[PDB]
RNA sequence: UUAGGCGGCCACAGCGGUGGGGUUGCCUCCCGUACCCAUCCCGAACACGGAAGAUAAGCCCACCAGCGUUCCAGGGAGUACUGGAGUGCGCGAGCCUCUGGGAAAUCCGGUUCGCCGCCACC
RNA sequence: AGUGCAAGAGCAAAAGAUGACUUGACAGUGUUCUUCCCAACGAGGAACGCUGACGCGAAAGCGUGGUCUAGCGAACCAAUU
RNA sequence: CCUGUCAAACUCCAAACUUACAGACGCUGUUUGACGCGGGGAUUCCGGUGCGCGGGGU
């Protein structure tokens, strides 16, 4: 029962929302892999008239690359209660977001016969706090 | 009419009831009809290709051969005989 | 203008404001009269003014009949008496006038009217037993300013 | 089996009603046909309801009418018991009349004209502007009611 | 769900099992569909024609009924894929089926994949299916060379149960030979 | 169908919810990237290879009607509307009688938590 | 939501979005409906083929311009292939 | 929640009715040849009224 219910890290997405690049270098060095450009939609009056133009960058981290980032990323921030999702995810910081879920999320992310995860198998804000707290840090 | 176009006054007949919205089921779009068969002409609003002039919606013609994948269906408009080129998607069998 | 020009229901339903522009505002002040905070069920007596013929009543007539009805209720029961009257019909039908002879005859918009069917309730007043003959008189003055003949039907009145 | 009698003329009458009466072999005023009770035949008399007089006749009355107004498919020849006997599948008028009522055969099937050309009602009818329920002579009648008309039109 | 105007997708679309847009294009040929499916442990290959109350399967082959002929290796791989496809095509020839069109369903048309190997099998069985030779795998990857050369990077065995150590793609050659035989109980 | 594949009708099948089910069997999740192939970044997905573990998701099985839906009963209603007729009524607007049809809303109570086809399979 | 433009209509593993590749917005000749209900009448339009050559795709297939209904012009003369 | 009204260019609903084809009865045609085809000659393209349904207009 417990083994197929215990939380794991899905993806650690690190991003910088600028609005006009040079900052792609610092992400590659801190994470371990390559970053991707971020475009925008709709014309804005803050001199952002072009649609398909680089605004910032993001890096989606999975498996070991994710944990080896978080061992040095988590001490850089004081984690709060109101900083948590209803789904059991959290964003802090340079934005660093961590996606957490239970061992059967492939069912929702696949192509063939996909189904969305039931509310009884989804992560809770409480079950989220408990997992990260059991890995070298505090709550509140 | 304020205009003599093909889709004049066809708000009703060329529109689906909300629950019959979206892509239509393929089974009827690939249905095979034989010659001499009496078929019902009714345009499927979800299928763009292979239609006929909306004035013939409701006719019950007789299949008299095919032109490519589409069928050549013989009808009688009032008193004038006409041959309608139409795909299976807009046809149903009689009886 | 006389009501003879607009009283019948022979024209189509012309109400769609998305295609009609320049419609004059309703001369009607309020539909809820008296003590609008109290409930309709809090009253032992419910008397309605029922229209006998199928007609179109203009906003000016609706107001003129409502005014001379509520003014009597204010005179006899005070400005804060224990009553509540409702005008349930709203002027939805838009009226035209051709005011050039019969060429380009479709008229310009001049007003609004309320299509009331026969047997329908135009007014409904809720009162207490003692104030019953005052409201029957408010309606006698109100039916004199509309087009059809009317009925003063008591719906909750076993007290007579 | 019902007996139809056209009581109203052709002028101003709808063409689709006119043609129904012609299909029921009834072409003039005061003419009478013996129509069976089917779904198909009922749809026809319902469409003719306002220009006709119908109902089921009594054996006694059908006989009286057949004796006086029935004609062969061609000719002046009077239809009596002897005529019936020599040309029909029955013995006398009663035998034919019983068959028409029980819907076993038709007048045409026996070599008789499908029309019993009646005489105007003696003492007149109850009116061609109102139905029977309103005191007129149009529409569906009682078995005793149709007899009064068929007998008056001897 | 919400009210009367709500449009609930067709059953096999809610289930996310049928691509109805691709199905219409597949049925346009008039030819029977060679339904090529793949599970984690297994591989399925059916010959489906269109019927009055639904689809009709005239001939099929599952990778589990492959062991009935002599297989002693796993069933969700490339050598198994071809063979399950050959076994489907052979039963198809016995059913009177001569030509077909490849239905890969919701799978990706990735070069040299298992669904294309299922197709290569049926082609070799005598069926006329519209294909593309350079989108199929090279004969050795179909045989199972990639798997044997992964057992060469040994240290620890690839297989748990005792089939063999260094792996035999010769079992494929032996099985293709067994099915190519004119006798065999199909 | 002791969990499968392809379907037909395309909500009676939807939304929500409860209970049960898996040692070499099935479906999954699952384990793992040498290869085919893969990500404008990520073996996440796609693709390939595989069983250490699990029935918690999914799925299959049994059931609940609160919501949406299908159909039916009874009431609304033979009311609204209406094809045909009228030297019936009404200043008129309009109404009425006869004849042939006949709703909708809403209420109450049932139904509905899919049905069926081909194939394979302790 | 979006889909160039009225209005009505179509569309969700798409007809929308993004990306890449491509030139079928191709030549020739038709069947049919429409223009013109019924019911004769040109230009124009559309649907649906075939022949030839092509594009994309694994492939079925899709591409006879834009998701559909507006965006059009005879004889004579000239220029042009 | 509660409470008051509407739609030619609204529709979760929805008739009467009109309409395609077919079968049945009826009627009709096979010496009165229908249905249909081909040809000759027209007149005609100021209409009006009642009833039903209309749209405009006091
Ligand atoms: Cl057409
Ligand atoms: Cl599959
Ligand atoms: Mg309309
Ligand atoms: Mg004679
Ligand atoms: Mg006399
Ligand atoms: Mg008289
Ligand atoms: Mg369970
Ligand atoms: Mg009068
Ligand atoms: Mg000139
Ligand atoms: Mg030139
Ligand atoms: Na549809
Ligand atoms: Na002028
Ligand atoms: Na870029
Ligand atoms: Na399970
Ligand atoms: Na033309
Ligand atoms: Na007949
Ligand atoms: Na004229
Ligand atoms: Sr009028
Ligand atoms: Sr003048
Ligand atoms: Sr008055
Ligand atoms: Sr993995
Ligand atoms: Sr008057
Ligand atoms: Sr009935
Ligand atoms: Sr198109
Ligand atoms: Sr009509």
mmCIF file with all atom_site columns, C-alpha atoms (C1' of nucleotides) in Angstrom, chain F residues 49-113:
data_model
loop_
_atom_site.group_PDB
_atom_site.id
_atom_site.type_symbol
_atom_site.label_atom_id
_atom_site.label_alt_id
_atom_site.label_comp_id
_atom_site.label_asym_id
_atom_site.label_entity_id
_atom_site.label_seq_id
_atom_site.pdbx_PDB_ins_code
_atom_site.Cartn_x
_atom_site.Cartn_y
_atom_site.Cartn_z
_atom_site.occupancy
_atom_site.B_iso_or_equiv
_atom_site.pdbx_formal_charge
_atom_site.auth_seq_id
_atom_site.auth_comp_id
_atom_site.auth_asym_id
_atom_site.auth_atom_id
_atom_site.pdbx_PDB_model_num
ATOM 1  C "C1'" . G F 1 49  ? 15.068  -3.414 -23.022 1.00 0.00 ? 49  G F "C1'" 1
ATOM 2  C "C1'" . G F 1 50  ? 13.106  -5.763 -18.744 1.00 0.00 ? 50  G F "C1'" 1
ATOM 3  C "C1'" . A F 1 51  ? 10.483  -8.021 -14.150 1.00 0.00 ? 51  A F "C1'" 1
ATOM 4  C "C1'" . A F 1 52  ? 12.815  -6.188 -8.151  1.00 0.00 ? 52  A F "C1'" 1
ATOM 5  C "C1'" . G F 1 53  ? 8.303   -4.664 -6.292  1.00 0.00 ? 53  G F "C1'" 1
ATOM 6  C "C1'" . A F 1 54  ? 2.719   -3.265 -5.995  1.00 0.00 ? 54  A F "C1'" 1
ATOM 7  C "C1'" . U F 1 55  ? -3.119  -3.699 -6.529  1.00 0.00 ? 55  U F "C1'" 1
ATOM 8  C "C1'" . A F 1 56  ? -2.243  2.514  -4.241  1.00 0.00 ? 56  A F "C1'" 1
ATOM 9  C "C1'" . A F 1 57  ? -3.871  5.168  -9.233  1.00 0.00 ? 57  A F "C1'" 1
ATOM 10 C "C1'" . G F 1 58  ? -5.770  3.200  -14.098 1.00 0.00 ? 58  G F "C1'" 1
ATOM 11 C "C1'" . C F 1 59  ? -8.415  -0.843 -15.659 1.00 0.00 ? 59  C F "C1'" 1
ATOM 12 C "C1'" . C F 1 60  ? -12.000 -5.042 -14.618 1.00 0.00 ? 60  C F "C1'" 1
ATOM 13 C "C1'" . C F 1 61  ? -16.069 -6.235 -10.917 1.00 0.00 ? 61  C F "C1'" 1
ATOM 14 C "C1'" . A F 1 62  ? -20.348 -4.943 -7.537  1.00 0.00 ? 62  A F "C1'" 1
ATOM 15 C "C1'" . C F 1 63  ? -23.215 -0.755 -5.917  1.00 0.00 ? 63  C F "C1'" 1
ATOM 16 C "C1'" . C F 1 64  ? -25.225 4.608  -4.621  1.00 0.00 ? 64  C F "C1'" 1
ATOM 17 C "C1'" . A F 1 65  ? -29.203 8.996  -7.957  1.00 0.00 ? 65  A F "C1'" 1
ATOM 18 C "C1'" . G F 1 66  ? -27.099 14.219 -5.289  1.00 0.00 ? 66  G F "C1'" 1
ATOM 19 C "C1'" . C F 1 67  ? -26.362 16.771 -10.576 1.00 0.00 ? 67  C F "C1'" 1
ATOM 20 C "C1'" . G F 1 68  ? -26.833 16.164 -16.023 1.00 0.00 ? 68  G F "C1'" 1
ATOM 21 C "C1'" . U F 1 69  ? -29.388 12.648 -19.315 1.00 0.00 ? 69  U F "C1'" 1
ATOM 22 C "C1'" . U F 1 70  ? -33.095 8.548  -21.641 1.00 0.00 ? 70  U F "C1'" 1
ATOM 23 C "C1'" . C F 1 71  ? -37.802 6.681  -21.222 1.00 0.00 ? 71  C F "C1'" 1
ATOM 24 C "C1'" . C F 1 72  ? -42.472 5.760  -18.606 1.00 0.00 ? 72  C F "C1'" 1
ATOM 25 C "C1'" . A F 1 73  ? -46.760 6.562  -15.110 1.00 0.00 ? 73  A F "C1'" 1
ATOM 26 C "C1'" . G F 1 74  ? -50.012 9.979  -12.977 1.00 0.00 ? 74  G F "C1'" 1
ATOM 27 C "C1'" . G F 1 75  ? -51.277 15.440 -12.689 1.00 0.00 ? 75  G F "C1'" 1
ATOM 28 C "C1'" . G F 1 76  ? -50.790 19.923 -15.653 1.00 0.00 ? 76  G F "C1'" 1
ATOM 29 C "C1'" . A F 1 77  ? -54.206 18.993 -20.261 1.00 0.00 ? 77  A F "C1'" 1
ATOM 30 C "C1'" . G F 1 78  ? -57.379 17.141 -24.344 1.00 0.00 ? 78  G F "C1'" 1
ATOM 31 C "C1'" . U F 1 79  ? -55.412 22.925 -21.562 1.00 0.00 ? 79  U F "C1'" 1
ATOM 32 C "C1'" . A F 1 80  ? -51.862 26.071 -25.517 1.00 0.00 ? 80  A F "C1'" 1
ATOM 33 C "C1'" . C F 1 81  ? -51.792 25.716 -30.624 1.00 0.00 ? 81  C F "C1'" 1
ATOM 34 C "C1'" . U F 1 82  ? -54.102 23.835 -35.046 1.00 0.00 ? 82  U F "C1'" 1
ATOM 35 C "C1'" . G F 1 83  ? -55.913 21.251 -40.765 1.00 0.00 ? 83  G F "C1'" 1
ATOM 36 C "C1'" . G F 1 84  ? -61.585 21.295 -42.374 1.00 0.00 ? 84  G F "C1'" 1
ATOM 37 C "C1'" . A F 1 85  ? -66.766 23.481 -41.772 1.00 0.00 ? 85  A F "C1'" 1
ATOM 38 C "C1'" . G F 1 86  ? -70.469 27.276 -40.021 1.00 0.00 ? 86  G F "C1'" 1
ATOM 39 C "C1'" . U F 1 87  ? -76.557 32.957 -42.554 1.00 0.00 ? 87  U F "C1'" 1
ATOM 40 C "C1'" . G F 1 88  ? -72.979 30.737 -34.346 1.00 0.00 ? 88  G F "C1'" 1
ATOM 41 C "C1'" . C F 1 89  ? -71.732 35.355 -31.019 1.00 0.00 ? 89  C F "C1'" 1
ATOM 42 C "C1'" . G F 1 90  ? -69.188 40.088 -30.777 1.00 0.00 ? 90  G F "C1'" 1
ATOM 43 C "C1'" . C F 1 91  ? -69.103 47.759 -32.540 1.00 0.00 ? 91  C F "C1'" 1
ATOM 44 C "C1'" . G F 1 92  ? -64.660 45.711 -32.787 1.00 0.00 ? 92  G F "C1'" 1
ATOM 45 C "C1'" . A F 1 93  ? -60.263 43.322 -31.240 1.00 0.00 ? 93  A F "C1'" 1
ATOM 46 C "C1'" . G F 1 94  ? -61.829 38.606 -30.925 1.00 0.00 ? 94  G F "C1'" 1
ATOM 47 C "C1'" . C F 1 95  ? -64.710 34.480 -29.507 1.00 0.00 ? 95  C F "C1'" 1
ATOM 48 C "C1'" . C F 1 96  ? -67.743 29.900 -30.010 1.00 0.00 ? 96  C F "C1'" 1
ATOM 49 C "C1'" . U F 1 97  ? -69.743 25.017 -32.004 1.00 0.00 ? 97  U F "C1'" 1
ATOM 50 C "C1'" . C F 1 98  ? -68.826 20.659 -34.936 1.00 0.00 ? 98  C F "C1'" 1
ATOM 51 C "C1'" . U F 1 99  ? -64.810 17.538 -37.117 1.00 0.00 ? 99  U F "C1'" 1
ATOM 52 C "C1'" . G F 1 100 ? -59.635 15.699 -37.577 1.00 0.00 ? 100 G F "C1'" 1
ATOM 53 C "C1'" . G F 1 101 ? -54.818 16.332 -34.715 1.00 0.00 ? 101 G F "C1'" 1
ATOM 54 C "C1'" . G F 1 102 ? -52.523 17.827 -30.240 1.00 0.00 ? 102 G F "C1'" 1
ATOM 55 C "C1'" . A F 1 103 ? -48.029 20.413 -27.128 1.00 0.00 ? 103 A F "C1'" 1
ATOM 56 C "C1'" . A F 1 104 ? -44.424 23.016 -23.589 1.00 0.00 ? 104 A F "C1'" 1
ATOM 57 C "C1'" . A F 1 105 ? -43.259 24.507 -18.491 1.00 0.00 ? 105 A F "C1'" 1
ATOM 58 C "C1'" . U F 1 106 ? -43.643 22.555 -13.749 1.00 0.00 ? 106 U F "C1'" 1
ATOM 59 C "C1'" . C F 1 107 ? -44.997 18.782 -9.741  1.00 0.00 ? 107 C F "C1'" 1
ATOM 60 C "C1'" . C F 1 108 ? -45.036 13.717 -7.905  1.00 0.00 ? 108 C F "C1'" 1
ATOM 61 C "C1'" . G F 1 109 ? -43.459 8.911  -8.633  1.00 0.00 ? 109 G F "C1'" 1
ATOM 62 C "C1'" . G F 1 110 ? -40.526 5.076  -11.457 1.00 0.00 ? 110 G F "C1'" 1
ATOM 63 C "C1'" . U F 1 111 ? -36.232 4.300  -15.028 1.00 0.00 ? 111 U F "C1'" 1
ATOM 64 C "C1'" . U F 1 112 ? -31.051 5.347  -16.226 1.00 0.00 ? 112 U F "C1'" 1
ATOM 65 C "C1'" . C F 1 113 ? -24.422 4.811  -12.767 1.00 0.00 ? 113 C F "C1'" 1
#
